[PDB]
Design a protein around this ligand. Structure first.
Ligand code: 105
Ligand code: 105
Lengths: 358, 358
């Protein structure tokens, strides 16, 4: 790669790996639309397997960006509408607190306090209907944002119902396949297990465990090459040939709600560029990102703004990922690590790299 | 042209011309995306000037569809947001009743009762500010739709403020030119006067007079050729090269409000296809089309629905126009006449024709 990119990436990431004791890491920088790859360390410490451009990492909540785009594609196909009540697709949800809660509320964490995590005790489908029927909102719909797997996860599950396809089949057929993300999976096949890195938590090798709505909220695994292609696709959606997918990508970057200086899209979160670094850096800390915050509706939603810092952090017990891009500059970055290290450190590193590149 | 198209157009339009005593008329049917033209009678009766494919007709309110698309293009360019207060682009509009009225309300006639017409005596820029500063609402914003030139006309004037271009300059350079609408004008130049048809009202040859916000609300003049291109462009916006225009067309067909079986877009009005003809035919009668109707917000707006009947009626003192198309069927029709005849007869004719072809 150009020495400028190589230098900026190595001067930032080497110290990060050292300070955070990250076992393995892969980074892609998209510059002027082209990708440049970097790797360090181990995918599997015990077996001394290095991180490569083919290593699979758990994306954790960056999976929500795929769920948002798949949902956007379903809207573009005319299968669902964000203004539709949740009950239109789950008639069994008859409890009165659901009146007024739409797919938009589920997609954007504004239903009224759905929990961050689905209880471990909820496994069966009956268990899931019961959990949502019994859930009591703390707030009226569309008034407060509380980041939650149980909210966008339910959106993903309902958004694909009209298609008749399973969520995995829909994601594969409508998102992964068209974008040539051939090494991106909801369930890692045996053929690819050799490339699946282990995550590390307190020194122990771990992989994400099955959980309700896992595919929809945090279950995608991908390589640094496929994630670079994912960034390129979201940076320039008009180059995508499949009409509804192009539209779905744009819908996921529309601004539906505002809290502080952040805007909520479908999966993606956005801020106006130039951004104030302390803003996105401090704002990524879970002390802020996972807190209940009042939101102002953007009526109607603002279509995807090119001059935006669009991003998403992700984590599982053993992994930490971050994606950020600026459409207007055809610039972006993907950082995949097999340790869940602090969000601020991720964003600080990304900012230093992207800011130096323009 | 297919014998099929020739047959239904002849059988439907000629009796219409006789029944309504229409001096001159031009019709274009877009079938499978290709245009087929028909012309009858006189553009200028006294001079016995035949209506031709180069004849310019006053579009009347069909002009609102160009205003809607131009606004859509400005939103796509990030110059304006429909969620922004009207006062953001007209700082001088300080009267308390404007608090809460947004560009969306103006573009969709939901500001709360802005009048059908700007009083004839309002002419100057000072007159215009005075008019809006003194206007008192009939209803709160976003509750009732009352079709109005003073509403979308103001949206048009404000939508182009950020660009710094005049309304005409913005319309010409951002919409007419990219679409190669080479014979469409807000102000007809000398070289085209010979093609500008006379409108006829109670036997007298008439042209629309200057009026406040005329360009923005009802001042476009065009030929059946450019109008066929206008329908093709709205039928298939993805074929448009200019990214923001492509997006603007799509935004103008988004569904922002619903009243009965009709959805309000930016300029365009839409209904799901298949449509109930009684509904669009009787609904076009001014008794109804100009009456206040309660609206339900579509939160968020539904992106352009391909299986829709998209349309707009238009009239000036001496002209009557109609445009309708169905994206999913690549089918559309434009009917331009130099007599303002009953809207229901226009919609009835258009329905008979399009229903016969698909
Ligand atoms: B996403 O990565 O923000 C959601 N993360 C999870 O659901 C998750 C899992 C499956 O394991 N740990 C997490 C986690 C949570 Cl719930 C909050 C913050 C970091 C990681
Ligand atoms: B549009 O055609 O609906 C708005 N029409 C006008 O403003 C207009 C003009 C310039 O002259 N007559 C009309 C008219 C009106 Cl206000 C209502 C219904 C038919 C024609």
């Amino acid at each position: 790669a150009p020495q400028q990119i190589n230098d900026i990436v190595h001067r930032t990431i080497t110290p990060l790996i050292e300070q955070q004791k990250i076992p393995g890491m892969a980074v892609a920088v998209i510059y002027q639309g082209k990708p440049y790859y970097f790797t360090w360390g181990y995918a599997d410490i015990a077996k001394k397997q290095p991180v490569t451009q083919q290593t699979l990492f758990e994306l954790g909540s960056v999976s929500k960006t795929f769920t948002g785009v798949l949902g956007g594609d379903a809207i573009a196909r005319g299968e669902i509408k964000l203004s539709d009540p949740t009950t239109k697709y789950w008639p069994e949800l008859t409890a009165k607190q659901w009146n007024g809660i739409t797919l938009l509320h589920l997609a954007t964490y504004t239903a009224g306090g759905l929990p961050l995590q689905v209880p471990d005790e909820v496994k069966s489908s009956s268990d899931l209907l019961r959990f949502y029927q019994n859930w009591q909102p703390a707030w009226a719909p569309g008034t407060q944002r509380l980041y939650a797997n149980s909210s966008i996860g339910l959106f993903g599950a309902l958004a694909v119902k009209p298609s008749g396809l399973s969520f995995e089949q829909a994601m594969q057929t409508r998102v992964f396949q068209p974008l040539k993300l051939n090494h991106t999976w909801i369930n890692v096949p045996p053929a690819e297990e050799k490339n699946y890195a282990w995550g590390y938590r307190e020194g122990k090798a771990v992989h994400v465990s099955p959980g309700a709505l896992d595919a929809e909220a945090y279950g995608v695994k991908s390589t640094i090459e496929d994630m670079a292609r994912w960034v390129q696709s979201n940076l320039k959606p008009l180059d995508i040939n499949e009409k509804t997918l192009q539209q779905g990508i744009q819908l996921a970057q529309s601004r539906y709600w505002q809290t502080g200086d952040m805007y909520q899209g479908l999966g993606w979160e956005m801020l106006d560029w130039p951004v104030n670094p302390d803003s996105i850096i401090n704002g990524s800390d879970n002390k802020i990102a996972l807190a209940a915050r009042p939101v102002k509706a953007i009526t109607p939603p603002t279509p995807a703004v090119r001059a935006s810092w669009v991003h998403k952090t992700g984590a599982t017990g053993g992994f930490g990922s971050y994606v950020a891009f600026i459409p207007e500059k055809e610039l972006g970055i993907v950082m995949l690590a097999n340790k869940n290290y602090p969000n601020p450190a991720r964003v600080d590193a990304a900012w230093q790299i992207l800011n130096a590149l323009a």
